[PDB]
Ligand binder design. Structure first.
Ligand SMILES: NCC1(c2ccc(Cl)cc2)CCN(c2ncnc3[nH]ccc23)CC1
Ligand SMILES: NCC1(c2ccc(Cl)cc2)CCN(c2ncnc3[nH]ccc23)CC1
Ligand SMILES: [Cl-]
Lengths: 343, 20
């Protein structure tokens, strides 16, 4: 289509048509583990890990998330895991990695996605210390666009943080980690996310909506620009007490416009929180701090990234930490058939 | 400094999600 052919509204309307087709009729069982060569573990977690793999028939590199069915069950993440796969196989956006393949075997669930060789934003943010406002703004813009997309599909994302933002070969980002994402038109109630990034209404055990994502954006922008988050302590409980008060202090190097944006994102009052008002996302996109961002150019990936990863070949993993490599064991007996029937 | 207090904290590494 032409670059000015459609409004954002029209573009998002057509994107929803595309999404709903796939949402209503999900792809299932589209590869097998023996089609991939396992190269390296890129991350680990409580019920899963992510590996760099090579698809043998194409030589393409992918990230493959491997979930142990029994562990997903023990941790009560069955419905959340079904959500993740159903959503990721249906989405399509420049800053998301949709599923290229998914499948399961007796023991595990597998989701295969475009590989992001730049590593986690977390790694770079901690090492460098903090990002300049233009640098933080460039990342933030991509999240604003991605949330507008996600939210227009009635999706809530619910785990924004630097650990869950992957940097690609051109220095743009991928919003990964859809484990808590959910398609919901009403309010919802699950206590989930990461302590530092939780909106007060989640902590106060209120029903909540997509406004929690916009609060989390405020937390991210603060952390990217300051080098530490707005609410931290050694223990989660102390972090929660800080959030519910919502008292924040800005570094003296923060610009006036940054502070003002953050005051409107980190707003405890839902009737005042940017992203949650009559005008929706446009209150964010039209804020003075974003006055210089070319939303159209960012979407088209036309803007030169402020930081472009070191890249020494298509399956390079130098931007990742090293993790202990564990076997992928497949039982001879089918585990959790019923629970993951639709996967 | 706030930076120093952060770096001395136990939450500068990768943060785990929470779950009810
Ligand atoms: N003219 C509509 C679009 C566009 C679509 C295709 C092409 Cl080739 C160019 C432009 C403008 C840039 N995008 C967005 N702009 C502003 N806000 C957004 N929120 C989500 C997407 C966009 C995406 C939609
Ligand atoms: N939250 C960061 C990670 C992750 C780490 C551990 C676990 Cl158990 C889950 C997720 C996101 C997926 N990964 C990706 N790495 C590289 N390229 C990718 N493309 C899509 C996802 C990833 C690896 C890093
Ligand atoms: Cl992921």
């Amino acid at each position: 289509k032409g670059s000015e052919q459609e409004s954002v509204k029209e573009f998002l309307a057509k994107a929803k048509e595309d999404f709903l087709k796939k949402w209503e009729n999900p792809a299932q069982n589209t590869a097998h583990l023996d089609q991939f060569e396992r190269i390296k573990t890129l991350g680990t977690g409580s019920f899963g890990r992510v590996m760099l793999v090579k698809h043998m028939e194409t030589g393409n590199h992918y990230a493959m998330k491997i979930l142990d069915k029994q562990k997903v069950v023990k941790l009560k993440q069955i419905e959340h895991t079904l959500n993740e796969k159903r959503i990721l196989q249906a989405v399509n956006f420049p800053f998301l990695t949709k599923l290229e393949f998914s499948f399961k075997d007796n023991s595990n669930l597998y989701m295969v996605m475009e590989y992001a060789p730049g590593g986690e934003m977390f790694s770079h943010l901690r090492r460098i210390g903090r990002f300049s406002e233009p640098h933080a703004r460039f990342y933030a813009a991509q999240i604003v666009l991605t949330f507008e997309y996600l939210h227009s599909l009635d999706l809530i994302y619910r785990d924004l943080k630097p650990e869950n933002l992957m940097i690609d070969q051109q220095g743009y980002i991928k919003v990964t980690d859809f484990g808590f994402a959910k398609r919901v038109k009403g309010r919802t109630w699950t206590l989930c996310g990461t302590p530092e990034y939780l909106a007060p209404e989640i902590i106060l055990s209120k029903g909540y909506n997509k406004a929690v994502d916009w609060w989390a954006l405020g937390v991210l922008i603060y952390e990217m620009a300051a080098g530490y988050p707005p609410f931290f302590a050694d223990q989660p409980i102390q972090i929660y007490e800080k959030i519910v008060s919502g008292k924040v202090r800005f570094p003296s190097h923060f610009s006036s416009d940054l502070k003002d944006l953050l005051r409107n994102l980190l707003q405890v009052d839902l009737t005042k929180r940017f992203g949650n008002l009559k005008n929706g996302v446009n209150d964010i996109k039209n804020h003075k701090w974003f006055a210089t961002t070319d939303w159209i150019a960012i979407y088209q990936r036309k803007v030169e990234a402020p930081f472009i990863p070191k890249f020494k070949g298509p399956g390079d993993t130098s931007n990742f930490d090293d993790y202990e490599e564990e076997e992928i064991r497949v039982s001879i007996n089918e585990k959790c058939g019923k629970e993951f029937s639709e996967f | 400094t706030t930076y120093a207090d952060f770096i001395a904290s136990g939450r500068t590494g990768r943060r785990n999600a929470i779950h009810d």
